[PDB]
Amino acid sequence: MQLREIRNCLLKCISECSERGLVYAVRWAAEMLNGMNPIANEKLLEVEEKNIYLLAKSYFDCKEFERAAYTLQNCKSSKSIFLRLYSKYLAGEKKSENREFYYISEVLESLHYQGNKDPYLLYLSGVVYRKRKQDSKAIDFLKSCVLKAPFFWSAWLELSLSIDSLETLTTVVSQLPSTHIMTKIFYVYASHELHQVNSSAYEKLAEAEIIFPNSRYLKTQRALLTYDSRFENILTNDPAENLYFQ
């Protein structure tokens, strides 16, 4: 066998196993790949860190969050840094069930000061500030995240949870591209989550259904807005499920 053939076979294993949920085979292959003799700023850094990132993500997928974080201790790409902090955050929360929280906040603030604008890090800064009850800051980070990654649902959801009134909701929406379908979807979600649904929400929802006529998510939104106007029954689901928290 050629070295490059072995590498390629391990890499194809990783892909086929991760697609099928076989996280232990992925972890083993990633360990072996990393054990071989070694063979714009961000993209280069991601290529350089690719093997070590694969190993850290395999641990993360086995729920080894401490080990994933430690694996990434030397890495510098924004992708690596995100997984490292998100690992630390989940490992701190596993153990709560958060000693790591202040640490994560400081790393994120240094990153901001340095001028990092990676949308996944901006999302974690958002989550951190919301949890510190710093809502104005949370909103400003999450808006910056969804401007860059408008199809990233979890940022829009955290944005909605950072917003405490329809007035604040209309202020934020006034700063987002009003034509963009995700802005429309967010508006519907956040109006319902605030329980302040007017006519515009129904209009926006009808627009989103033209593009996604059979979405389980939008069907739920429609059922919720229908209850708002006042087999499965949406009222008998856990509301955490209907709100997409679970």
Contact flag: residue 188 with a copy of itself (CB under 8 A): no
Binds 20: which of Hg ion, a copy of itself, none (CB < 5-8 Å by kind) = a copy of itself
Residue 71 CA to residue 45 CA, distance in Å, equals 16
Q: Which is nearer to Hg ion, 70 or 103 (CB)?
A: 70
Please report, as residue ranges, which positions from 215 to 244 form the binding site for a copy of itself (by CB under 8 A). 215-218, 244
- The Cα 84–Cα 163 span in angstroms is 28
Binding map of Hg ion across residues 139-168, x = CB under 5 A, - = no contact: ------------xx----------------
Which residue in 44, 47, 206, 211 binds a copy of itself (CB under 8 A)?
211
| By the rule CB under 8 A, 44 interacts with a copy of itself | no
Rounded Cα distance between 119 and 186, Å, is 17
Identify what 128 binds: a copy of itself, Hg ion, none; CB under 5 to 8 Å per kind.
Answer: none
Separation CA 26–CA 16 (nearest Å): 9
Query: 44 vs 171, which CB is nearer to a copy of itself?
Result: 44
Helices assigned H by DSSP within 100-134? 101-114, 119-131
Number of residues that this document lists for the chain: 246
* Residue 20 within binding range of a copy of itself, rule CB under 8 A: yes
> Residue 190 in contact with residue 214, Cβ under 8 Å?
no
